[PDB]
Each structure stands twice: as C-alpha cells, then as structure tokens.
Design a protein around this ligand. Structure first.
Ligand SMILES: Cc1cc2nc3c(=O)[nH]c(=O)nc-3n(C[C@H](O)[C@H](O)[C@H](O)COP(=O)(O)OP(=O)(O)OC[C@H]3O[C@@H](n4cnc5c(N)ncnc54)[C@H](O)[C@@H]3O)c2cc1C
Ligand SMILES: Cc1cc2nc3c(=O)[nH]c(=O)nc-3n(C[C@H](O)[C@H](O)[C@H](O)COP(=O)(O)OP(=O)(O)OC[C@H]3O[C@@H](n4cnc5c(N)ncnc54)[C@H](O)[C@@H]3O)c2cc1C
Lengths: 399, 399
C-alpha cells in the first residue's frame, strides 16, 4: 500500500474498496475516476424498482464510510503508464499513483446481427440505459428481450407487471445457463410462461428489417423495442494496453494483484479463482463486487489479513420469485426440499458432490439460504436423509 | 532484474532462459534447482531416436552459453516465501533470491481407471520413463497406447519400426484433437493404420484386470504394457501455495510476470496469451519453451526489449511423416497445396480467416514452412488463387 491511491471506475466494487481502506485505517490520498457523470449508484434496481418507479435517488450508494475521497465523475481514464506510475485522463489531467486499482467493471456485449438495425435496440447496464428503456415502455407495447440470463428475466417480469407484451429469445435450450441448476432453470421458464412471456428456445437472431427481428429458424418477431442481454465483456482495455495478463478479464490472485507491480483489480473486470471448482472465472455477481473489493482493501492495509475467500453466490428478483443461488449448479446428486409448484412457489435445492454440499438454491425461502451458505463454506457432509427430511431445521444443523 | 537469480526447473525453458541472461550481459549469481538427477537434456528424442538407440549423451542440452551457473541436480524446491525472498530445498538448504523464475514444466496426467492396475503402466516424460519403456519393448510384444496426441503417435511409429504390435485408444473422434487441422488428423490416422497400428476411436479406458484393458464399449484389449499419454498438468504447486494466480498453469503476461512481485514463470508451466486467438492457453510446444525463455530473459536484462511475441508452432516426427504445424487449426477456409496421398506423402495446408493467413501445416515439406510462418507472423492476405497455384513459390511471395 503505497500512497496515493487511484481507483479507476466508480461502481459498487470501487465504492466498497475505498470505504474499506478508510475504515481499515488508510488516511492517505484516494482519488476515484468514474466515466459516468452520476453520483455512484447500484445497478440491480435498474431492472426492477427503478424501471418501474423511476427515482434514482433511491439507488445511490452510500459513500459516507469513504470520507476525504475525491470522485472525478464524468471523466475517462484513457491509459496508464505503469513505469511512470501515472494515469492519463480524458480532461487532459494526469494523476500520479503509488497504488493503482482497476475497478472498471464490464459492458454489455453487442449483437453483431443488430449492428445496423433501424429500430430501437438497447442494452441494460446504466442509469442512462434504464431511462431510455423506460421511455419506450408503454402499456401494450411489444418488447423483445434477447438473452435468458437474470437481467433479461428480471426486466421481463417488470415489463409484464407494467402491461408490456414480452417475447424472449434464448439461444441455449434453458434459461440461466450460467450458474443455475437445471431444475431451477426449468421452473423459472414455467413461471415466466405462466405470466405471459413468449419464450423461444434454441433460436438465434440473424438480423432485422423495418421493425421486425429475424431468427435462425427462418421466422420473424415484430417488436417496438429490442433489449439485448446476452452477457457482458470485461472493461479491460487499459490493462491490455499496459501489458497486464487479461483474457476478457484481468487475471488476479486472492490479494487482487495483477501481473503488473503496484496495479490491482477487483469486481466485474477480474478473472479470479473459484474455490469450489478450482478454476478461474469472471464472477459477475453483486456479492463478489462488494466482498472482493473489501477483501483486497483489507489486505492492502493489513497484509496479515487473509486473501479474498468467499464462495460465489447471487440473487435475482423475478416477479413473485425471490431467487437465491450459491456454489456450483450441479454435483453428483440434487436434494429437493419442498414442492416445485407454481402455486405459491417455495423450495430449496441442494447440490452434493461425494456427500459434500457444493451448491444450494432457495426460491422464496431466504431463511434457509444463510445456513446453507455456511454449510457450503466449510464443505459440510450432512446426512442426506436429514437434508431431504422437511422436519430438519437447516439453521440447527448448521451448528 | 534483482540479483541473485534462482530458477526452479532445469528443462529446456530453464536452460534457454539462463543462457540468454548470460548472453544479454547479466553476470550476477544464477542458481538452478532441478529435481531430476540428470544432466539437463531434451525430451523429443525420448519418443524417437533415444527410444530406438538408447544413447542419452546424444540428447543433452548445451549449457556452454550459460557459464558460471550452479545447477543443483536431484534436488526439489519444496516451497518459496515471496515475502522473505527465499526458496526451501529438499536437501535442507535455503536459497535467497532477488528474482525467482518458475520453469517447472508439466507432468503426465494419470489415468484414474488404471490407478490400481497390476500390469505395467507407464507415462512418457522423462529419461527414466523412456528407459523403463524400452526395457519392456521386445519385438512382437503388444503395446497399448492410451491417447492420440503427438507423443503417443511418435511412440507408436517407433514401436512399430521395432517390430512391436501397437494398439491405440483415443477418446476423441480424431487424433491430435489439440492444435491440428482435421485434414491433417484424418491423414495421420490413415498413415498409422497403414503401418499396422490398431486404432480405436471414441473409446475410453474403464479399468483393467490381470493384463487386459477394459473399454467403455464393453470390450477388452490384452497388452504386455500400457503407455498413457492423455496430456499433461502444469507443475504449479509451489505457485499455488505461495498465492500466485494459477489454473493448471501459472498466469503470466508477455514479460513472464506472475501476479507475485519478483516472481516470473516460463515454458510448459505457464498459461499465456495466444496472439492469434487472443485467448490464454497453456502452450506446450518445444519452440515456446525455448523462445519464451529467451524473451523473458532478454526483457529482464534490457527492459526496452519487447515482450514475448511469437505465434505458436510445433513439429512431430512420426515415421515417414515429418509434420510441422503453425497457428490455428482452422479458419473460414483451408487451402491445400499438393496431393494428400500415402504414396510418398508431401503436402501443405493453409488456414485462412477473412483472407488473412492464421495457420499452416507442412508434411514432408520443410521448405515451405518457414515462409508460411513469416507470412503468418505479419497477418498476410495473399491471393488465394496464387496460394493454391502450385506454380507459386511461397518463399518468393513471402517478400
Ligand atoms: C440491470 C442490472 C441488474 C442487476 N441485477 C443483479 C442481480 O439480480 N443480482 C446480482 O448478483 N447482480 C445484479 N446486478 C448487479 C451487479 O452484479 C453489479 O452491478 C456489478 O457486479 C458491479 O461490479 P463493478 O463495480 O465491478 O462494475 P461496474 O458496476 O460496471 O462499475 C464500473 C464502472 O467503471 C466505469 N469505467 C469503465 N472504464 C472506465 C474508465 N476507462 N475510466 C473511468 N471509468 C470507467 C464503468 O463505466 C462503470 O461505471 C445487476 C446489474 C445490472 C446492470
Ligand atoms: C516424449 C516427448 C516427446 C516430445 N516431442 C515433441 C515434439 O515432437 N514437438 C514438440 O514441440 N515438443 C515435443 N516435446 C518436447 C517439449 O515440448 C519440451 O520438452 C517442453 O515443452 C519443455 O518445457 P519445460 O522446460 O518448460 O518443462 P520441462 O521439460 O518439464 O522441465 C521442467 C523441469 O522442472 C522439474 N521440476 C518440477 N518441479 C520441480 C521442483 N519443485 N523443483 C525442482 N525441479 C522441478 C521437472 O521435473 C522438469 O524436470 C516432447 C516431450 C516429450 C516428453
């Protein structure tokens, strides 16, 4: 930890990191460069309550635990020189650094087949995106969502509740193909179909003409607006140009270190080790952005602190479904607690691998999720009969 | 470049690196820790001329360009402390370092289904391995090779020439599924079949009992010896324990830097960027071990030197086939020069991607390979009609 600290990016990972530095005792200079001209804000409401109600002052991140920080908003870091220890800014200024932190997140992947489209096509990542989408979301408008990940499905539910007709195209045979158990994915499709979502599986967009989208099966979908959500790409251009190891994501170890001395990275921009799979992955969850940011800051101030160690998890709010998912999507068996029914959905899945818990899912059952995450964390091997037994209390069993 | 330099591993990458340091002008301490008790030697002859003729003094690496280096042979680096800047050795000694270089290569992957086998099962990576395999290779012995990569196929040809009966099991539908064009792979299978190799595709080993190997199709193959060659795993345990970013391979940038300050890595142990694909890969070729070793050394002595930049390539000698392959295995089209015939095989493949050369293969045509590699290097876009035209001289066209 060499002063001054410069952080590139002012999203959740960045805010979490600078607040932990200050709370841990670092009182030297901290400067944050953020390219959006927005008071730092949280993204999950953009698909839900913001999209519906429209109040951005309900979604701002609390920067109060980060006193004495200069936030350069609406400014783009254009390059950094890791030998000179400087960053070049879009406003013509240069910042010196002792420690540089790359927290630049990721940007929506574009659909090449819609690149010359003459109809409204948006992605959903920023306040500006959400505001733009809202203003075309009239009741009985027709929305096409490309991509069956959580963002798209969250938007789908919000749109339907608002009286918008929703069609959704998914290339893979299942929704949430990333980091969701098949049982959950099948149920999620059943729910959305029941809410009026027109789901098209194993189809791809081949292009568009005069307000209609074309598909690989040779068919058409007319819509007033397309929202594309087919995943994101790490914002790692600065690192690539400066000579750091990247591959759609900056490689970091558990201390947030990149291959370049005095340069760290955290959050959506990173590829990091998933302790459960033992493989490097770009983890794009809210909890990772916050918790990896805190862990890296904590170790920078106190090098005896351990590195980042959390196992990955996320939630997704999709209408009546409060979904929570932790660990791996699959193992050698799945234990199902409760019934999988559209009639007041409430159930828990547990994935096991040689008797050890390696994954869990709760749907409208937040009470069981916390003890499942603790069990997950220690690689517990409970009695599978007790794990199926609805009489069992997971909170009790967790100690 | 802080003295003293310690290198872990005494294979080709290591020898190439220390020789380049010395040639570039670094005259400080260099100490190499090598766990094999062997004068440093080259591995490719182990599947060919050594396996046949048995003279290890024909395969030693030239260390003369590396004067004043202490080589601790037969000693294992057990851990390193990247804060203390020391390495702990199996003989009880500790080495201080200013710069640590991890050049520990990779080890053959084991076959879990043969873990309790009571017949001879060997891998082929070391002098000891080769010597052990040789001594069971009687004429009219039956050898089963598991794995259709280049090592297995090279051994297959050597064994057949020696009068050994060869059966070979390959899980994938084609040989050389890694980094070889399908056209080449199909031809290579045709050649080996013509030389008496009993090839079994899309089959897996399920176990063994009393001198017979069992397969996923429910059948049997009796053999006097099994040689397993199903790929390798990076020897990255020290890095993993010391907190470096690894995933079956230590992540490095173009200067050989790991995520840990003052620690570098090179050769088979690394995952690095493939400039043609833009993706990180573990490149396990001879040319990478030598050339990445030299590039990293060169930049350590002269930081104005560029980073490692070579595009990947390899050769494989399989009986009458002198095979050379560069770049990617495929693109949007393949140009074929000459005829693909078992009657005196001699042909060239060129892979193109939007008019640009991205890959090439020569079989018994070393003359065309060098100009194809130069063309590959600059991302050339020659006239495809001229590239097919046998009247065309690639050496001429290369300038
Ligand atoms: C619509 C939506 C819904 C979501 N819902 C969920 C959910 O249900 N569950 C869940 O777990 N997560 C969800 N997420 C939230 C999410 O996971 C977090 O927003 C994200 O992980 C935060 O990571 P970050 O801080 O690393 O990156 P970012 O939030 O992307 O922050 C990076 C910032 O750096 C900026 N930047 C990039 N380059 C430069 C530069 N050169 N100079 C200056 N600034 C730069 C970027 O523009 C960006 O503002 C959702 C996200 C979206 C967009
Ligand atoms: C049978 C065979 C045939 C081949 N034929 C071809 C070919 O046709 N074409 C081709 O391109 N390549 C071929 N290769 C050659 C090959 O590509 C090179 O041998 C390899 O890439 C060299 O890389 P290296 O120096 O990084 O690793 P290595 O050669 O594996 O050297 C690493 C050394 O470090 C040692 N070590 C590991 N851990 C420790 C430790 N903790 N302490 C001390 N020492 C340690 C290892 O035991 C090993 O001796 C072949 C290899 C084999 C084995």
């Amino acid at each position: 930890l060499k002063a001054p600290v410069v952080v590139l990016g002012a999203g959740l990972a960045s805010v979490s990191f600078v607040a932990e530095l200050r709370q841990a005792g670092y009182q030297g200079l901290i400067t944050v460069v953020g390219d959006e001209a927005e008071r730092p804000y949280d993204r999950p409401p953009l698909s839900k309550d913001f999209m519906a109600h429209g109040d951005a002052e309900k979604i701002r991140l609390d920067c109060k635990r980060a006193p004495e920080v200069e936030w350069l908003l609406g400014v783009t870091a254009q390059s950094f020189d890791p030998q000179a220890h400087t960053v070049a800014l879009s406003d013509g200024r240069t910042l010196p650094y002792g420690t540089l932190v790359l927290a630049t997140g990721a940007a929506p992947r574009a659909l090449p087949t819609l690149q010359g489209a003459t109809m409204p096509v948006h992605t959903l990542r920023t306040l500006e995106d959400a505001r733009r989408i809202q203003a075309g979301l009239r009741p009985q408008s027709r929305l096409l969502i490309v991509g069956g990940g959580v963002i798209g499905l969250e938007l789908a539910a919000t749109a339907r509740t608002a009286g918008v007709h929703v069609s959704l195209v998914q290339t893979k045979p299942r929704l949430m193909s990333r980091a969701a158990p098949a049982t959950l994915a099948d149920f999620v499709a059943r729910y959305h179909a029941a809410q009026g979502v027109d789901l098209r599986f194993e189809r791809s967009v081949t292009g568009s003409v005069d307000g209609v989208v074309l598909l690989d099966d040779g068919t058409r979908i007319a819509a007033d607006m397309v929202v594309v959500g087919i995943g994101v790409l790490a914002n790692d251009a600065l690192a690539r140009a400066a000579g750091l190891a990247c591959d759609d994501g900056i490689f970091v170890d558990a201390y947030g270190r990149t291959t370049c001395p005095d340069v760290y990275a955290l959050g959506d921009v990173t590829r990091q080790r998933n302790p459960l799979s033992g493989r490097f992955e770009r983890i794009e969850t809210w909890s990772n952005a916050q918790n990896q940011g805190i862990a890296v800051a904590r170790h920078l101030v106190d090098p005896t602190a351990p590195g980042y160690a959390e196992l990955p998890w996320y939630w997704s709010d999709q209408g009546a479904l409060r979904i929570q998912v932790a660990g791996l999507a699959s193992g050698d068996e799945e234990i199902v607690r409760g019934e999988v029914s559209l009639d007041a959905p409430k159930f828990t899945l547990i994935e096991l691998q040689k008797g050890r818990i390696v994954g869990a899912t709760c749907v409208n059952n937040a009470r069981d999720f916390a003890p499942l995450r603790r069990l997950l964390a220690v690689g517990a091997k409970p009695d599978r009969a007790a794990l199926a037994d609805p009489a069992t209390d997971l909170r009790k069993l967790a100690a």
